[PDB]
Amino acid sequence: EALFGKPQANDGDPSNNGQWDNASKLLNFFINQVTKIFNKDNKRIRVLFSGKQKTQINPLLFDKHF
Amino acid sequence: MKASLTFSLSGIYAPCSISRDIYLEYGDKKAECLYGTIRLPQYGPGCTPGKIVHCVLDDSLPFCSIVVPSKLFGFMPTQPTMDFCYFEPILDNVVPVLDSVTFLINEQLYSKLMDLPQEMQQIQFLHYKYNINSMETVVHSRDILTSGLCQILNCSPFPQGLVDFTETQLILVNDTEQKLSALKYANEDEEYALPKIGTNSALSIDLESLPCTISRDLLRPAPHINDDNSIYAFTDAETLLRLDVTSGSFITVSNMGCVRLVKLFVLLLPNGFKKRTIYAPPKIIASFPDCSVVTISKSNIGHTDIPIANQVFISRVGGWLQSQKCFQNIILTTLKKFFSESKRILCQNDLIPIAFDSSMADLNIAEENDESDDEDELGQYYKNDSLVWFFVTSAELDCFSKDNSHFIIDPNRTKLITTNITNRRPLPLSRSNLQRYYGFAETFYYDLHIFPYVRQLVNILETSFNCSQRGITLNASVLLHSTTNNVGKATMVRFASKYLGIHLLEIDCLSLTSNSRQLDSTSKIIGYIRAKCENVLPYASPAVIFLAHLDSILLDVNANQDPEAIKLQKSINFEMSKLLDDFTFKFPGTTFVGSVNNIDNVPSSFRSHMRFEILVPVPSEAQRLRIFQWYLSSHELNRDVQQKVPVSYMDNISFSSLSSYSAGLTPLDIKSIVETARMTATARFYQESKKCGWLPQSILITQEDLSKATSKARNEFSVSIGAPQIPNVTWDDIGGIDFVKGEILDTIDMPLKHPELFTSGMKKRSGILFYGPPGTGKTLMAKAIATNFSLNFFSVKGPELLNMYIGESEANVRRVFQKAREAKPCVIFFDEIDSVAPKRGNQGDSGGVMDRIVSQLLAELDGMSTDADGVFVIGATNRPDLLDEALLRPGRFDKLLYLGIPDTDTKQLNILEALTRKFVLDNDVKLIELAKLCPFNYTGADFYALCSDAMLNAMSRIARMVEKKVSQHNELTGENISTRRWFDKIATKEDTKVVVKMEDFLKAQEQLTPSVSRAELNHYEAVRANFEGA
Amino acid sequence: CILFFDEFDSIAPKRGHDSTGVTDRVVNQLLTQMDGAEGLDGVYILAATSRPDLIDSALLRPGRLDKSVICNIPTESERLDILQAIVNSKDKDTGQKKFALEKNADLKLIAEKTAGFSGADLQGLCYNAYLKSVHRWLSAADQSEVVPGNDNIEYFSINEHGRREENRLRLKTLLQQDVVHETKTSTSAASELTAVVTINDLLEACQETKPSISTSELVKLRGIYDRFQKDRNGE
Amino acid sequence: CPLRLRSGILLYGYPGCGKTLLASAVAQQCGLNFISVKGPEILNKFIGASEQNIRELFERAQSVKPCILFFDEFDSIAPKRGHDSTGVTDRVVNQLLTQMDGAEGLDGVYILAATSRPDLIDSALLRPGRLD
Ligand SMILES: Nc1ncnc2c1ncn2[C@@H]1O[C@H](COP(=O)(O)OP(=O)(O)OP(=O)(O)O)[C@@H](O)[C@H]1O
Ligand SMILES: Nc1ncnc2c1ncn2[C@@H]1O[C@H](COP(=O)(O)OP(=O)(O)OP(=O)(O)O)[C@@H](O)[C@H]1O
Ligand SMILES: Nc1ncnc2c1ncn2[C@@H]1O[C@H](COP(=O)(O)OP(=O)(O)OP(=O)(O)O)[C@@H](O)[C@H]1O
């Protein structure tokens, strides 16, 4: 939660700067790299996350089918 | 296990003789009939499933040899066939028996096959004609018996299995389509017709890229170990004979003067490779890109004649990877290792590909490992992913020689050097699938015939290329925009790049920015992109510059923000535009493509400046079908499974079906679905192997698995969009729905079932408003329709849509309507809409917020009625009068459904029977009596309350009886065991069991009091009179 | 160009209907342009509202602003006109009638029972009548023409063990197993496979539906509209 | 039993008859989370917070173990719909009615509210299941 954290609900603006594609960036990069390895080999890398709530954890991981 | 193999011309089901040594190692003696599976070598990474054949002992066969009917492999040994096979002896001979089987026969043979009076006779026919035997003979799927006359289409439970006459279920058919006529064994109809046997000096033959690498095992003659593997080209034996040469020889391949030297071998049968052709790895194909056909000429040069080299100079070929300074070290490290492996053979003006594990790049494993012995094992711990190209600018021989072309390289005797970069147009997909040959994540293949937008883009790319080669320059610019993400924009860009053989320049501005705030940000980003692009581009033209999520940098900052940041963003925008213009001007024959997930964000000034626009839509039904065809491909399925046994799917999978239930999904969803089906199949297989002991040869996939996967994907889609208010509801939980059932069904399902009839440029059904006395249960009916029809349901409650300030409420309205439009077919529900329907006046909504909200409602309602093929609105409200008359108009609402009181005893009888569905009612209950007593003011809420009170009374009885149990037992045994311990241990199931009696419901009925006044019923009847009589 | 504002009663009502006055300043902003003589006349301003009473009188000053257009109840003549137009409508996708139109039915009597309706009500009546025809057609073929083409699948079974229709289904998928790409269908004599609504069906549909407005609302809105038009006459 | 139990009951009677006490006291007897509420605390001068206030009350209620809700002077919070000219009262009434229409989680939370004036509260709430 603390690293790839959510952009907080109700930021204040309907769509703030780059829709926080400034702090979720790292999650996108990590998932891209891990998938690049995964499709290249299955038994090597396997991630296990742990967060307070599904809504709290960023959705991109879901929207990228992670 | 490794054993030799021979082919017998006998029928398909001739028993496989097993050499005495092979059997005797472990084979049991008294075993009635022996069976054995066998796995062949395959000219492809996928190891084909091993056939199971009945076997018979023998001693004549030499040590570790097997004779098998070639007819079992759809071919006869008219060509030099594979020498050996891998055999496995089954233990315990637990051979599966086939429940059923499906043959295939022609109409003329079929007629005389079933014109007989009896049915057993036919059995004998096969026993006479094919020598089949109950519980002995083994059949497999696709097995052919009579060339184009008798064949096995499939077998059902297992593509292979044992046959028992008295138990097998034989099905057979006539072929009106005459499929069999075109089906014949491999090299069956090709008689021995020697084309000018050993006469012509040199020929002209089609030269094809190797679809896949080749293992060192399958090369006759056994190649010299030190020899260069990379110079091996294959071809059919008949061609080899035509040019009077031998396998493993040396031959020249050339055109228009340019020449190269290659080995030659033969494709040992069996094989499906195109005949009368010469295959080669991309190494050689690279030097003859345009030349589809090549001139083939024997070479009279032996290995000894080759002269050793003295100096070799090589220039790295321009490429996106080359500029990757994070990669440089591993590239030349791999090159040095590759050359050190063995002496390689090259020439002047040649190209060298080097594969390498990209992910392993950042570990500079030094060379202190003196000639690391296990190169093979570090390699297998690698799985090469990335390819490069190295050029040979020049080299010198040590021995003076007329030969200015060919030579050899020694690991140490020779001296090499690497020099400046060189340009070279990469090969197109047609000539070779570089990705496939080495085995990377094969990019999804595209049939532009079915994807016209990709045709659109690839029609721009090659036109620009031709213009450049025409001495003409017209800068191009394409932007990809989609409503949803993961629609394939990047994938189709990549495919188009590979198809036209254009060097691919690509950056994701979403990843490497490394800086977004600092005022230096704009300068840093622009400088970085400029640096990389000008670093690599000059030597790599033609090429394409690709920006991923380019919008994440360029946007139109709102005026609602501090000025200096707006100035900074305007700057970065301008310098991006200048950068693209400068690149196109300075580098003719260069183009770029940008990807964006929403057009509205990118600076309009920028957009206008660009050239081309294209939206990648969500896959359509046919596109989904083709995407499945690709993903379900076996070769691409088993890419990332090192497990020895392969995987596959039934031939009875109706891809059209899956495509039908894949509405709205996207490629990522398709990958999720397919890999999830692979999941369930693998798990079930690994459980079955334990269950029945005997292990099926391969892994299989079945339709119901993909049905489960698509259901899971729909559930996940709902989770992403929400729609949680759907726990469970069924029609059996409700009653008294008779008349409204027809309306709801016709309004909702009928367009869904047969939209084509209504797909006539017609105003389709708009909405259903639900008005009626309170307690009838319109909310229950809404939940029931949401759960039963299994459709995308999203409820927006009116009150929770407003906001502190005025205007954002309508933003939510617009966005929810659009989002529902995406999730079509959709059901949107507004509950107590009357909260937002006070008309104008000093005594109503002074401020007009509701007015603008209802403007949203009506506006999007007319907008949807044109192209919203799948949206359906249901209206819930207790008082319709307060509702805005603007909504009662058709187009917004046509069915003003009245969920009235149950007035006939029929309605309340249905309601009661529905409520008591899970009730443990004693036989004393008489629901008809309760229906008699109840007046015609009750509602579903009233009946639910009555049943709840009756159950509560029964529970009071039970609780009191347990209390007496505990109290009395406190004295009888003296053990004051509180009711808690009884609930944990002594509250048996019967005590927990709930039993109710008629008197409970009757007493509650006497206590019952309706929840509405007859005056209010009359008021709602007055509403009904005006809303139903006209 | 034509610019149009829908629900102008929710855009620039009469002043004194807002606490913050944003409506008022917005209204003067709008007035600035039209009253602003800057050769700004190519744009053809337009607007609609069911509640013109709620608009500012300044927004209806003659000479300052042009005429206003009233929409009246569809009577027999107008009802027949609209019904004939819509029923005879030629489709964008197909070009023929949007509905399976009775060639020379008695469209005259239909208008009689629709006194007080609205063109929206008339088209909704015709639309639900078309659905009743569609349901009738689906019922007509419920067990009339339930059979595909080329039923010739010659075969025989032994040890069938009671799997007749499922055997036929597996045979079908096995024979149709190969050549299926997108639809493999041509225009198989597209002969308006729809249902012409019977006159009785249309009459019962007209019975089923009611006008979107009630008597009291109709009376009050007609009265206010007449008073408004009289006001525009200087009354 | 797969039946939603009766959990919402209204309180009314002669003024100062003790309903306030009994409401406060039953919490300790049964033993639950009694999130008391003051009528005027919910209604907020500013739109976008009243519905938010009631929603947060409900999230509190569910987020704790089976809870007890009480609303005093219930007549004020839920007036008869429509009569209000501001509209805030009607919309908060609709919010309160809706929150008994939630799919799940309503188990364990029992709604209670006291007012001697049952007539000023719209009967749509007395729908058994909400206030039976
Ligand atoms: N026909 C196809 N079209 C698109 N993608 C496909 C297709 N077949 C398979 N795929 C897979 O879909 C995925 C598409 O992911 P990609 O990152 O390219 O997304 P995109 O839709 O181009 O855009 P974004 O960067 O917003 O996700 C890849 O894993 C690709 O292999
Ligand atoms: N056949 C039935 N249909 C609907 N509700 C039923 C039925 N049988 C019993 N009931 C009960 O009647 C009550 C009606 O609940 P529901 O929320 O659906 O009401 P509603 O009429 O939509 O009103 P509201 O405006 O309060 O949401 C519920 O307690 C439900 O369990
Ligand atoms: N048997 C009783 N149980 C409880 N309280 C009682 C009893 N007899 C009298 N009372 C008194 O009745 C008083 C009524 O106070 P309370 O505020 O609870 O009344 P109420 O009728 O609920 O009024 P309100 O709705 O105005 O809050 C209590 O202070 C209590 O002391």
Side-chain angles (χ1 to χ4, degrees), chain B residues 26 102 187 315 690 749 753 823 845 922:
Chain B
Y26 289 131
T102 78
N187 187 260
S315 279
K690 294 281 288 224
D749 313 81
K753 302 293 187 283
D845 189 83
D922 173 286

Side-chain angles (χ1 to χ4, degrees), chain B residues 731 733-737 772-783 829 831-832 876-878 899 910-912 914-915 939-945 947, chain D residues 4 97-98 100-101 124-125 127-130:
Chain B
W731 311 97
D733 316 295
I734 54 178
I737 325 297
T776 56
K778 42 92 185 159
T779 326
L780 269 283
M781 153 59 32
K783 304 314 301 295
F829 176 31
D831 154 30
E832 317 323 336
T877 283
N878 199 7
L899 163 53
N910 309 131
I911 274 296
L912 176 44
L915 269 87
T939 76
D942 309 77
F943 298 106
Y944 154 81
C947 80
Chain D
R4 200 260 273 174
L97 205 159
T98 288
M100 282 68 94
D101 295 311
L125 262 288
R127 281 203 215 205
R130 299 147 202 76

